[PDB]
Copies of this chain bind each other. A is one copy, B any other.
Amino acid sequence: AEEVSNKQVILKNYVGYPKESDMEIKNVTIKLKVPGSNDVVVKNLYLSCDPYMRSRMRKESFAPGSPITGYGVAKVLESGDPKFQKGDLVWGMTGWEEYSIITPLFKIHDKDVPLSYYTGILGMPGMTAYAGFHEVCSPKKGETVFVSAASGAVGQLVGQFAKMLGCYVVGSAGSKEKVDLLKSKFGFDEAFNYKEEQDLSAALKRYFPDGIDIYFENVGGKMLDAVLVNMKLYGRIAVCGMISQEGVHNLFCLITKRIRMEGFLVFDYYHLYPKYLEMVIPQIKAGKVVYVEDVAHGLESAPTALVGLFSGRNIGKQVVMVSR
């Protein structure tokens, strides 16, 4: 059994405005051995920085003194689990460290796409966009679609999925750079900077003169109130996230417009993952669906990457490359 140094990113204390100083790099030794258990021993390759991670920094929560955990991409080294062997590439819950021992996780089968994608378009955020838009929104060709946080990991896919259906798509984001990207790279019909608008309702009016069939909700609050008054009869709202979290005032619109507003969790849809891959892999290979990610290098960079994600300093999907 190989015994190796193992760098780790440790939660120093519960978090307040998350800062780099609440994490800490620690250097330990690890013996790369299956414990008599069903554990998988992996070398981590990529780590996802995901918004839900913030709530886990307070007290299912992270433990101070212990490594941070989250979605990543890793190589199997040893396995007591029948489903995985040495050399398998996998994605799932792993540790923020060079090597992890994982308890009883998806086998990667296509190595022809950059492997970082299995933290985003081919991982949890991609499955999130697929379940939310294709299942929860019941979309039809020619319908109008608004996407909140449109340049994030999830929303940049929702808009391309809608485009591919023949929908008219508008997105909102937090900078000129992000807006230009929405239009020029993701093929959104329109986009605006929400920070610039003094009246979100009037602005959605201008982009949707006939109303909105589908809102993919990443935000909540005032944005949700502005959407509600601009929805079409029988409009659908897929409640994915509420990252901005402020009272919502316009729920009466659910009756007058007969709107179905429905929350969902990506874990409930994992039986549809092979089918999602079946659709999106050849779209990617043909350049008809695209993805933009931010890749920080080395674990020494992971605290900075996680903190910057919480503010939106990243462009699209934030990833840390642990090792090549």
Mark A residues whose CB is within 8 Å of B: 220, 224, 239-242, 245-249, 251-265, 268
Alpha-carbon distance between A265 and B254 when the two chains are bound, in angstroms: 10
Number of identical protomers:
2
Give chain B residues whose Cβ lies under 8 Å from the Cβ of A254: 239, 261-263
| New A-B pairs, 17, CB < 8 Å, besides A239-B251, A259-B263, A262-B262 | A220-B251, A239-B254, A241-B255, A242-B251, A242-B255, A246-B249, A247-B248, A247-B249, A254-B261, A255-B264, A256-B263, A256-B265, A257-B263, A258-B262, A258-B263, A258-B264, A260-B263
> What's the least CB distance linking A169 to chain B, in Å?
23
Give chain B residues whose Cβ lies under 8 Å from the Cβ of A247: 246-249
Alpha-carbon distance between A249 and B245 when the two chains are bound, in angstroms: 10
Cross-chain contact B248 with A258 (CB below 8 angstroms) = no
Alpha-carbon distance between A245 and B247 when the two chains are bound, in angstroms: 14
Alpha-carbon distance between A245 and B256 when the two chains are bound, in angstroms: 14
Alpha-carbon distance between A115 and B311 when the two chains are bound, in angstroms: 63
* Nearest CB in chain B to that of A245: its residue: B252
Cross-chain contact B261 with A261 (CB below 8 angstroms) = yes
Alpha-carbon distance between A268 and B241 when the two chains are bound, in angstroms: 31
Cross-chain contact B263 with A262 (CB below 8 angstroms) = no
Q: Is the interface of A mostly helix, strand, loop or mixed?
A: loop
Give chain B residues whose Cβ lies under 8 Å from the Cβ of A248: 247-249, 251
Alpha-carbon distance between A264 and B246 when the two chains are bound, in angstroms: 25
A-B contact pairs, 18 of them (CB 8 A): A220-B251, A220-B252, A224-B251, A240-B255, A242-B255, A246-B249, A247-B248, A248-B249, A254-B263, A255-B264, A257-B263, A258-B263, A258-B265, A258-B268, A260-B261, A260-B262, A261-B262, A262-B262
Give chain B residues whose Cβ lies under 8 Å from the Cβ of A264: 255, 258
Alpha-carbon distance between A111 and B12 when the two chains are bound, in angstroms: 75
Alpha-carbon distance between A245 and B259 when the two chains are bound, in angstroms: 18
> What's the least CB distance linking A245 to chain B, in Å?
6
Q: Which of A240, A245, A248, A254 has the most CB of B within 10 A?
A: A254
> What's the least CB distance linking A55 to chain B, in Å?
9
Alpha-carbon distance between A242 and B241 when the two chains are bound, in angstroms: 25
Alpha-carbon distance between A259 and B252 when the two chains are bound, in angstroms: 18
Closest 7 CB pairs of A and B: A247-B247, A254-B263, A255-B263, A260-B262, A239-B254, A248-B248, A261-B261
Alpha-carbon distance between A138 and B247 when the two chains are bound, in angstroms: 28
Known: A242-B251, A247-B247. Is A262-B265 also a contact (CB below 8 A)?
no
